[PDB]
RNA sequence: GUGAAGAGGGAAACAACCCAGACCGCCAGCUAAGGUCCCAAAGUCAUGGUUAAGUGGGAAACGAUGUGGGAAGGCCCAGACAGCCAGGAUGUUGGCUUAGAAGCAGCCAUCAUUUAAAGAAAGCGUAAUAGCUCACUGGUCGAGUCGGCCUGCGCGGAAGA
RNA sequence: CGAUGUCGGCUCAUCACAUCCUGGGGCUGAAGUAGGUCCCAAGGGUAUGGCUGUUCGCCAUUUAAAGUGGUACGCGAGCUGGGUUUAGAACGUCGUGAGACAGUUCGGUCCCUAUCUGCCGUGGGCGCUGGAGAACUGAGGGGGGCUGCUCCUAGUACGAGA
RNA sequence: UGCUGAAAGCAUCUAAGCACGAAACUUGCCCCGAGAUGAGUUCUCCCUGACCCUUUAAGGGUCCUGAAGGAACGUUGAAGA
């Protein structure tokens, strides 16, 4: 899984949920959008 | 349950029909005479001293003679104490024979291996030899470069060095028994076991899971 | 915690947790740490010989016999 | 030992006249070949009616060795020379149409059934 | 929490038996149903069961909300029960589960053959559907996680065991 | 200024940093640098204050209602933000273009009807559709809650023999 | 500067971890077979021949992978001396010329009788505080770790067939 | 990676709770270990009398009374520099 420093407002449709103590980003308004950051 | 002390008398082959050779080790097991049973007004644990031998009447010493005197007028040369598991033993019963293996024919064997003196630096440690020509001389079987420059800068533990070798304990867990004869003191086992002819060993019914 | 220790075999090192130390080394986890705060020189060994820590509420001193230290 | 640069005689019909082995095949860091091994081979002399030429590279099966076949009954099934049959790498089986002599009956046991029907009386 | 205004009243047909280790709940759709909330203390009465702070235990006003969350689901579990969430999509798959025995064909060298937790049974009402009979909301979920483990639904057909997520999508598989 | 052209040390150990600067002692007082939970001599001293992490005891653009300080602002008791409910229609099978399009391929109108309330549509998804999201209003819920900025302290981005 | 052997070989090895293989997880223009490609994990594993001193490269062929780097680009009181290199020769370039040339090719001697640290085996002396003979515990200490080929599961699943 | 579920009445694999998860970690598997002064245990064998001279943990003698077993001797070894 690729690693980044932030998610930087990439799409407003994202809820930015915490799962198991880390952020999990998922989106419907942008394809292939998956991020472990908030 | 317990173990037996024997005498390794050689190796041979017994075949099958029409072929396959079936190599087998030949062992003689004179019935182990018993010297002591514990948890019977002696010690807090269940164990038997199985003993084999008798020594010579003008060579046996007082501290050994008086240690076998509870069991008889012969110094049985050793105790061989085994703790009891999945069974029982009492102070009355026949001297322990190869009928221990009448139905349990998978065993494990403990004994000392390769009693062959010093061997040699390469004959022991399986090194790669240097060039016999091409300008190389004086070095061929010496142990080699024993480390590396400055940073670790020391000789390691768990490495290969010369000394007096062999006659140390090995345990074999995959063995099947081919035949036993309690009336002729015979044990016949498939394949090979540690130590040369005359070796004593320990043979036990298998307890491995 | 980590409790790093050199076994005497080159870079060979052991590590533990405080959970593991009380689960399988409860008499030794204090023994390896108190010696580093005894006096310097031969008096350190002379005080360490008096330490004798036990766990599981049972000792070899039932006729000496150790009484409770109180204020 | 049958290994790199070992020269073998062919039991292949109208086959190659001088052939030499390379590598060993069958396993990682493998040592040496014997009866029932297939090895990579090179042509040095082909004979004028050969359909291969010098420096062509093939495979061959070892059918006899001067060390023989082991473990029948504790003895050994002995032979006097190292001999092979060249194989077709594109179509499998021998490169020729027949085989010279009975070769070895170990080819009838388990693994070489498509070879003992081509010509061998075994 | 802000939920203690609605402590949930015991409905006519449900019984709760009071014990200092594991309290049990009984109803006509759930028997031998267990509750364990050791981070809190109860106050049980002939028509109510409420949660309060436990002696020597530290809690940031949350553990009685998580304890009420077990009471919330057990009252409906023992009186009505829960929805079916296991169905096979593929046409080449079949099920025949009954009681405490699982027979399920999903294209594997084994008919799944599961031995289950206690207080749950399974039945097939059709050749492609599985219904779990039980009143513990965690057990009927965890058994469904174990049963859906064989052949995941793929974006190219979806033929596995049916599931929902907001990111469920089809793929066009555009080739050659 | 200090060493190279002085002692004493202290900072864990460097010449220089920090303090001191040598005539010599004294079972005498008072101090500087630095130390006072323990190893190791002396406060786990007393006041409130910021951080929540083994940070302190390495690593940036970028980014964040992580945590305090502060002024203005949106939503707010004819009632708030999340959740639950009602929904999110009707004129309408539109009109011009073209072979054609059930809001969501161009431009043309964007009005009126209804209702607590709205668009033949801000953003996805799809066939050209479908299926969703968003605007927005009251019932339930309810007293504080949130975005943006200025700033103090921590945080993530992240490997080495 | 009153000395510190430098690229290569043979032999003896070790550390890192930005993971090549192995054990796993995940995205995908993941249909399937594959590839593209990232992160948990450093316990184990990881190249032969023709040319060249080759480090490197060019080719040929194997393999569970043919991973990267540290360590004075590891191990000449370790052995070697193929390369770098004087003393000889010759072709070129330069110079009036002697001579110069990291231009080129050829050729070119390697010292040794072991204190203390390190490491293997093995004694005496002393320690266990009455002595002599045998058997036994356990503060601690090391060792190990797979992988091709093929068929049945299956030509089933998947896909327009392959 | 999931089920149940919260502080935050929603949400979420985590806070409580339960279901798993690799050759790595732990157990199992083989060997070494009382220089373990921090010298553990069990059995067998051997030893339990006095006195002179001396202000003496320093000995110099006498009568009475003691070794278990080792070392030595070799002949030798499948022991060994």
UniProtKB/Swiss-Prot annotation, chain A:
Gene Ontology, cellular component aspect: cytoplasm; cytosolic large ribosomal subunit
GO biological process, one term: cytoplasmic translation
PROSITE patterns named in the record: RIBOSOMAL_L36
Record GO terms (molecular function): rRNA binding; structural constituent of ribosome
Entry keywords, A to Z: Ribonucleoprotein, Ribosomal protein, RNA-binding, rRNA-binding
Alphabetical list of InterPro entries matching this protein: Ribosomal_bL36, Ribosomal_bL36_sp
Biological function: One of the last ribosomal proteins to be assembled in the 50S subunit, it contacts a number of helices in the 23S rRNA, acting as molecular glue. The simultaneous presence of uL16 and bL36 probably triggers ObgE's GTPase activity and eventual dissociation from the mature 50S ribosomal subunit.
Subunit structure comment from the entry: Part of the 50S ribosomal subunit.
Cross-referenced PANTHER family: 50S RIBOSOMAL PROTEIN L36, CHLOROPLASTIC, LARGE RIBOSOMAL SUBUNIT PROTEIN BL36C
Family, similarity comment: Belongs to the bacterial ribosomal protein bL36 family.
The protein's name in its UniProt record: Large ribosomal subunit protein bL36A
Species the sequence originates in: Escherichia coli (strain K12)
Organism phylogeny: Bacteria, Pseudomonadati, Pseudomonadota, Gammaproteobacteria, Enterobacterales
Underlying gene: rpmJ
Curated annotation (Swiss-Prot), chain C:
GO molecular function per UniProt: large ribosomal subunit rRNA binding; mRNA 5'-UTR binding; mRNA binding; structural constituent of ribosome; zinc ion binding
Alphabetized UniProt keyword annotations: Ribonucleoprotein, Ribosomal protein
GO-annotated biological processes: cytoplasmic translation; negative regulation of translation
Superkingdom assignment: Bacteria
A single cellular component GO annotation: cytosol
Similarity remark: Belongs to the universal ribosomal protein uL13 family.
Function: This protein is one of the early assembly proteins of the 50S ribosomal subunit, although it is not seen to bind rRNA by itself. It is important during the early stages of 50S assembly.
Assembly mode: Part of the 50S ribosomal subunit.
Protein name: Large ribosomal subunit protein uL13
From Swiss-Prot, chain D:
InterPro entries: Ribosomal_uL14, Ribosomal_uL14_bac-type, Ribosomal_uL14_CS, Ribosomal_uL14_sf
Cited Pfam families: Ribosomal_L14 (PF00238)
Phenotype when changing residue 98 to A: Reduced RsfS binding
Superkingdom, natural source: Bacteria
UniProt GO cellular component terms: cytoplasm; cytosol; cytosolic large ribosomal subunit
MF terms in GO: large ribosomal subunit rRNA binding; structural constituent of ribosome
Keywords: Ribonucleoprotein, Ribosomal protein, RNA-binding, rRNA-binding
Effect of residue 97 to A: Reduced RsfS binding
Effect of residue 117 to A: No change in RsfS binding
Gene Ontology biological process terms from the UniProt entry: cytoplasmic translation
Family: Belongs to the universal ribosomal protein uL14 family.
PANTHER family recorded: 50S/60S RIBOSOMAL PROTEIN L14/L23 (PTHR11761), LARGE RIBOSOMAL SUBUNIT PROTEIN UL14M (PTHR11761:SF3)
Subunit organization: Part of the 50S ribosomal subunit. Forms a cluster with proteins L3 and L19. Forms two bridges to the 30S subunit in the 70S ribosome, contacting the 16S rRNA. In pre-50S ribosomal subunits interacts with RsfS, which may inhibit association with the 30S subunit.
Name this protein carries in UniProt: Large ribosomal subunit protein uL14
Species of provenance: Escherichia coli (strain K12)
Curated annotation (Swiss-Prot), chain E:
GO molecular function ontology, one term from the record: structural constituent of ribosome
Alphabetical GO biological process terms: cytoplasmic translation; response to antibiotic; ribosomal large subunit assembly
Top-level taxon: Bacteria
Subunit structure: Part of the 50S ribosomal subunit.
GO cellular component terms, semicolon-separated: cytoplasm; cytosol; cytosolic large ribosomal subunit
Alphabetical keyword list: Acetylation, Antibiotic resistance, Ribonucleoprotein, Ribosomal protein, RNA-binding, rRNA-binding
HAMAP family listed in its UniProt record: Ribosomal_uL6_B
Family as reported in the entry's similarity comment: Belongs to the universal ribosomal protein uL6 family.
Protein name in UniProt: Large ribosomal subunit protein uL6
KW Ribosomal protein (keyword) present: yes
Annotated NCBIfam families: L6_bact
Modified residues (N6-acetyllysine): 43
Taxonomic lineage of the native organism: Bacteria, Pseudomonadati, Pseudomonadota, Gammaproteobacteria, Enterobacterales
Role this protein plays: This protein binds directly to at least 2 domains of the 23S ribosomal RNA, thus is important in its secondary structure. It is located near the subunit interface in the base of the L7/L12 stalk, and near the tRNA binding site of the peptidyltransferase center.
PANTHER family: 60S/50S RIBOSOMAL PROTEIN L6/L9 (PTHR11655), LARGE RIBOSOMAL SUBUNIT PROTEIN UL6M (PTHR11655:SF14)
């Amino acid at each position: 899984m690729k690693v980044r420093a932030s998610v930087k407002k990439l799409c407003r449709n994202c809820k930015i949920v915490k799962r198991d103590g880390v952020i999990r980003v998922i989106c419907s308004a942008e394809p292939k959008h998956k991020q472990r950051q908030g | 349950m317990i173990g037996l002390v024997g005498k390794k008398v050689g190796m041979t082959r017994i075949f099958t029909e029409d072929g396959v050779s079936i190599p087998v080790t030949v062992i003689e097991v004179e019935a182990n005479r018993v010297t002591q049973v514990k948890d019977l007004a002696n010690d807090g644990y269940r164990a038997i001293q199985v003993t084999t031998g008798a020594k010579k009447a003008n060579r046996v010493t007082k501290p050994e003679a008086g240690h076998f005197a509870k069991a008889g007028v012969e110094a049985g040369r050793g105790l061989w104490e085994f703790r009891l598991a999945e069974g029982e033993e009492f102070t009355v019963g026949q001297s322990i024979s190869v009928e221990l293996f009448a139905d349990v024919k998978k065993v494990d064997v403990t004994g000392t291996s390769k009693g062959k003196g010093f061997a040699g630096t390469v004959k022991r440690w399986n090194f790669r030899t240097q060039d016999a020509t091409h300008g190389n001389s004086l070095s061929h079987r010496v142990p080699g470069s024993i480390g590396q420059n400055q940073t670790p800068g020391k000789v390691f533990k768990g490495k290969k060095m010369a000394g007096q070798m062999g006659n140390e304990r090995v345990t074999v867990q995959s063995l099947d028994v081919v035949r036993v004869d309690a009336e002729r003191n015979l044990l016949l086992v498939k394949g090979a076991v540690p130590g040369a002819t005359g070796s004593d060993l320990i043979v036990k019914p298998a307890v491995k899971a | 915690k980590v409790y790093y220790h050199h076994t005497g075999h080159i870079g060979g090192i052991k590590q533990a947790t405080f959970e593991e130390m009380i689960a399988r080394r409860p008499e030794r986890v204090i023994e390896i740490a108190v010696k580093g705060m005894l006096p310097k020189g031969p008096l350190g060994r002379a005080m360490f010989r008096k330490l004798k820590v036990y766990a599981g509420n049972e000792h070899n001193h039932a006729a000496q016999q150790p009484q409770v230290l109180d204020i | 030992m049958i290994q790199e640069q070992t020269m073998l005689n062919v039991a292949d019909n109208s086959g190659a006249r001088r052939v030499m082995c390379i590598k060993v095949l069958g396993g990682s860091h493998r040592r040496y070949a014997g009866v029932g091994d297939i090895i990579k081979i090179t042509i040095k002399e082909a004979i004028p009616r050969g359909k291969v030429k010098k420096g062509d590279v093939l495979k061959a099966v070892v059918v006899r060795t001067k060390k023989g076949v082991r473990r029948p009954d504790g003895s050994v099934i002995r032979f006097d020379g190292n001999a092979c049959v060249l194989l077709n790498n594109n179509s499998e089986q021998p490169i020729g149409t027949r085989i010279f002599g009975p070769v070895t009956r170990e080819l009838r046991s388990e693994k070489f059934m498509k070879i003992i029907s081509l010509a061998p009386e075994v | 929490s802000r939920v203690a205004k609605a402590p949930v009243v015991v409905p006519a047909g449900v019984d709760v038996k009071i014990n200092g280790q594991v309290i049990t709940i009984k109803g006509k759709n759930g028997e031998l149903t267990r509750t364990l909330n050791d981070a809190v203390e109860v106050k049980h009465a002939d028509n109510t069961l409420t949660f309060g702070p436990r002696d020597g235990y530290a809690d940031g006003w949350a553990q009685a909300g998580t304890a009420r969350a077990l009471l919330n689901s057990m009252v409906i579990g023992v009186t009505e029960g829960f929805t079916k969430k296991l169905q096979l999509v593929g046409v080449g798959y079949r099920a025949a589960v009954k009681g405490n025995v699982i027979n399920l064909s999903l294209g594997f060298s084994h008919p799944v053959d599961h031995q289950l937790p206690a207080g749950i049974t399974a039945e097939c009402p059709t050749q492609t559907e599985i219904v779990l009979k039980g009143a513990d909301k965690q057990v009927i979920g965890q058994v469904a996680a174990d049963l859906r483990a064989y052949r995941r639904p793929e974006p190219y057909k979806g033929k596995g065991v049916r599931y929902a997520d907001e990111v469920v999508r089809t793929k066009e598989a555009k080739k050659k």
